[PDB]
Write a protein that binds this ligand. Structure first.
Ligand code: S1P
Length: 416
């Protein structure tokens, strides 16, 4: 029971983690208006966070292995909660202070999101650990949707964008106390692995496909609420609320759709997983293309297109994990996962928000400023993402090309 209590507390911690991650994304319009910065700074607010998370994830993966885990995880949670609450008090004259606070929150969330799954895995046994990790990861879309809803509801209730960053820190400290109390006390080269992995074609192409998925996910999940609000302005705070509910349902249903497609395809071929990923990505790309055309005219069609595009886009998470598990022999599933996460962050979430902001800024600078042209510039900048989704689908098909050969090679090597 105590181990189940620890798993529940860490899952609630993950919910709070993603809520903190997307609270700013919920209320980006107010930050832009108050601080006066253009779209480039708004993109920077998440590019810096993701870069810090990128750089800090391997370090905390190493420190958890070579030091205590409960203390580090709790220090991380009282670190990012305190930093979020402090950053809520930043004056208007300072913006780089807010960006730096986003970076520090990124470091803390890196520590938590890198160490907590190891604790959850160590606590339980095979089937129990599988179920508990499934819950811990189902905490993700719920966390993101609750982050959007919390941001754009504390906005409307309190009346200041500041209070959007003030409600989550208290729960952060409380969950830190519960982690530091309820969780049972924790109990216990790369060169060759990297060369073998870069020689492994299926892993390389699946990693690039995951990078494209992360690019699309970061860029859209940040800029869609603001883009929909600009759509409402041109067409003449429910946008973020409905987007949060849509994100919750799509995160919960995309894995189910992927599992169904994998089940119905595996009876007919061995490359069911990458082919299913590729078809899902192509469908998501088409519907993400249609998001902008729909939102030009009516917003209900935009919400439906978001629903379908997220459902098809979010399906390729468990399937990507399965592909990586199959192609990579057991002795390298640690280095493979670490390098895949680093590469996905490097080519996706790290650069996508700032790149979309920069392209939007250039397009807007071309023409005289107006709300209609703000709409058009943001739409054209976000139009880059469907092309990235199509490219990722191409990379998934390239993975499918070598999937059989590399699965056979992995089985041959492990059977030795
Ligand atoms: C229009 C696009 C907007 C993008 C929305 C931004 C919010 C990002 C939310 C990220 C959703 C990722 C969903 C991942 C699910 C899996 O990791 C687990 N639920 C299942 O893994 P398992 O248990 O099977 O191992």
């Amino acid at each position: 029971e105590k181990r189940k209590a620890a798993a529940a507390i860490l899952s609630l911690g993950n919910v709070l983690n993603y809520l903190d991650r997307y609270t700013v994304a919920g209320v980006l319009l107010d930050i832009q208006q108050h601080f006066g910065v253009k779209d480039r700074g708004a993109g920077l607010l998440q590019s810096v966070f993701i870069c810090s998370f990128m750089v800090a994830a391997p370090i905390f993966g190493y420190l958890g292995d070579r030091f205590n885990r409960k203390v580090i995880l709790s220090c991380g949670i009282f670190f990012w909660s305190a930093v979020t609450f402090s950053s809520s008090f930043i004056p208007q004259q300072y913006f780089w202070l807010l960006v730096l606070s986003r970076g520090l929150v990124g470091i803390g969330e890196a520590s938590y999101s890198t160490i907590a799954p190891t604790i959850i895995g160590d606590l339980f046994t095979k089937n129990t650990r599988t179920l508990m990790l499934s819950v811990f990861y189902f905490a993700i879309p719920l966390g993101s949707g609750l982050g959007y809803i919390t941001g754009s509801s504390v906005k409307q209730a309190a009346g200041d964008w500041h209070w959007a960053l003030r409600v989550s820190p208290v729960l952060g400290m409380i969950t830190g106390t519960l982690i530091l109390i309820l969780v049972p006390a924790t109990k216990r080269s790369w060169l060759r692995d990297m060369k073998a992995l870069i020689r492994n074609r299926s892993y390389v192409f699946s990693s690039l496909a995951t990078s494209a998925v992360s690019f699309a996910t970061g860029a859209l999940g940040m800029w869609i609420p603001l883009y929909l609000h600009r759509a409402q302005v041109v067409q003449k705070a429910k946008d973020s609320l409905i987007f949060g509910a849509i994100t919750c349902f799509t995160g919960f249903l995309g894995v189910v759709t992927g599992a169904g497609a994998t089940r119905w395809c595996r009876l007919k071929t061995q490359r069911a997983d990458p082919l299913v990923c590729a078809v899902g990505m192509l469908g998501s790309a088409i519907f993400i293309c249609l998001i902008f055309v729909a939102a030009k005219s009516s917003i209900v069609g935009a919400y439906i297109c978001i629903f379908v595009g997220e459902t098809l886009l979010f399906s390729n998470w468990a399937i990507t994990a399965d592909i990586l598990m199959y192609v990579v022999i057991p002795t390298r599933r640690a280095t493979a996962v670490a390098l895949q996460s680093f590469t996905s962050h490097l080519l996706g979430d790290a650069g996508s928000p700032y790149l979309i902001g920069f392209i939007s800024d250039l397009i807007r600078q071309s023409t005289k400023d107006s709300p209609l042209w703000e709409f058009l510039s943001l739409g054209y900048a976000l139009m880059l993402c469907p092309f990235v989704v199509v490219l990722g689908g191409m990379f998934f098909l390239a993975t499918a090309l070598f999937f059989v050969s590399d699965r056979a090679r992995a089985e041959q090597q492990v059977n030795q």
